[PDB]
Every structure is written in C-alpha cells, then in structure tokens.
Symmetry: C3
Subunit: 147 residues, 3 copies
C-alpha cells in the first residue's frame, strides 16, 4: 500500500520457497506474521486465539527477556484473589511459582515453601484421614499428684 510516496509491502508470497509474510514490516524486516516453511516456524508478534490443538512438548520461553513465562487463565495473575491456575517461573526470583485455587482456598508454591491454605486430604486403604488433624501433634502427656 502506497503511503506518502513510497510503497510498503504488506504481504509477500514467495513462489520458490512458499515463505509468507503478513503485515507491515518492522525496522528489522520481519512482518508481524511470518511463515517460513523451510524451517516451519510459526513466529507472530502478537496473540493467538484458538480452542483445541494437540501437543507433546512445551517450553515456557522468555521472548523479550523481561516477560514472565507462565500459564494462567484469563484474568488470573500471581498471588491475586481471582480463581484460576497460575504456574510459571518468576524472572525476578528465577523460581517456579504455582498458584491454584482462589482467594480463600488456594495451593501456592513460591519456589521455596509449598504452603496450602486449603483442606489437604490424603487417602489410605482404611479410609481418609484429615492431614491437619493427623499432624496436630497430639501428645499423650501425664500429670502427677501426691495424695
């Protein structure tokens, strides 16, 4: 599309290799959407919206060196009161951080101490025993009196 007096390429469909670029090229000559079928790389400078796709391997990648590579439901952050699942490595502390639950009941790991402000239940073949009650430190003590 011709702006001012210069033509800026908006897309380029290569006949020889099939490489496809979409959008206005940035200062580095890379389109916001780029296709490289020689290497088969889906590199887009944006967000992807879809529903269901299968996969095996995942890498939490820090693209710009400052973004936090983590998984979160929409509207869910680290340590917030919102209900959701948050799992990732905090770049400031270089520690994997976990946040599953809500404001009241949650399971959180900050990379150092795994604290759970939720009912932690562990099962046995004889049944289920409350972990909090199981380890309340109930000590059988004796008190003595002379009479």
């Amino acid at each position: 599309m011709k702006e001012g007096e210069i033509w800026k390429q908006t897309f380029l469909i290569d006949a020889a290799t099939g490489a496809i670029n979409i959008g206005l090229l940035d200062e580095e000559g890379k389109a916001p959407i780029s296709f490289d079928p020689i290497n088969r790389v889906v590199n887009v400078d944006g967000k992807v919206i879809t529903r269901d796709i299968n996969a095996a391997n995942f890498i939490m990648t820090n693209l710009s060196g400052e973004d936090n590579p983590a998984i979160y439901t929409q509207g869910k952050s680290w340590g917030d009161n919102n209900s959701g699942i948050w799992m990732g490595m905090d770049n400031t502390s270089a520690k994997a951080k976990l946040d599953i639950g809500n404001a009241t009941q949650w399971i959180r790991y900050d990379g150092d101490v795994l604290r759970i402000s939720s009912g932690v239940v562990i099962g046995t073949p004889n049944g289920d025993v409350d972990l909090g009650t199981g380890m309340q430190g109930k000590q059988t003590v004796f008190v003595y009196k002379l009479a």
Copy 2:
C-alpha cells in the same frame, strides 16, 4: 512458536519408537539438568515424571514416587516438616532395678 491456547493434549508416538514426553530444552529423563520431564517410557510402558534438578528433584518412574527434596505439607496450625513428622519418634522406656 511462543504462545497458543489449547484444551486437549495427546502424547502421541508417531513412529512407534519415539518417547512421547514433555521436556524443557536440554532436559532428559533422569539427567542432572534442571527442568520438567513428564511422559510415558515406551520401554517400560510407565509414565515417568522428573521435576527439579540434580540435587533437589521430584521423580516418579511409574512404580515408586521418590522425592529427594524438602517435602512440606501444610496444616491450619502451621507447617510441619514431613521428614521430621514421620521420623518414627517412638516413646520408649528403659527400666533398672535399684
């Protein structure tokens, strides 16, 4: 790629010999590298887990879940060390005649 959303995942063995597993780059099963490894080993047909590093790790080989890491479990009264909690501290008595 960097970020794509999804709901359903299948660890698929395409050629019948590749191990369908998830791993960070440079991370394998049982290695000393820090990372997360989760998948089913085709040789043993057992799901294998490897989260942590050479010293502190949480590993499951499909048979025994062993953790060479500080396992902490929380209670409303606070946090009690699981290793100290189950050290088998038995109140024993020794008797002497005098």
Copy 3:
C-alpha cells in the same frame, strides 16, 4: 461451486488484508476454516490433528 442456480463461495483469499476463509460459509457468514491475520486468530469449527 455452483449448486442449483446460485454460486456458494468455497474459499476467499483477500488481497488487501490476507484474510482466508475455507469451506462452505454457514448461516452466519463464517467459513468452517477462517484466517484473520489482522487479528491472527485460528478459529476453525472442527478438530485439529
């Protein structure tokens, strides 16, 4: 593809924006496979393998 006496679009490759639709458009004007590179959305009314 012309069915009966009306042409129903099967694909549309937009030159200006690069938007690509694949398949027979439904009642809402959305193809079963739609590409929106302006928004970069992979929205398909089906399954992905």
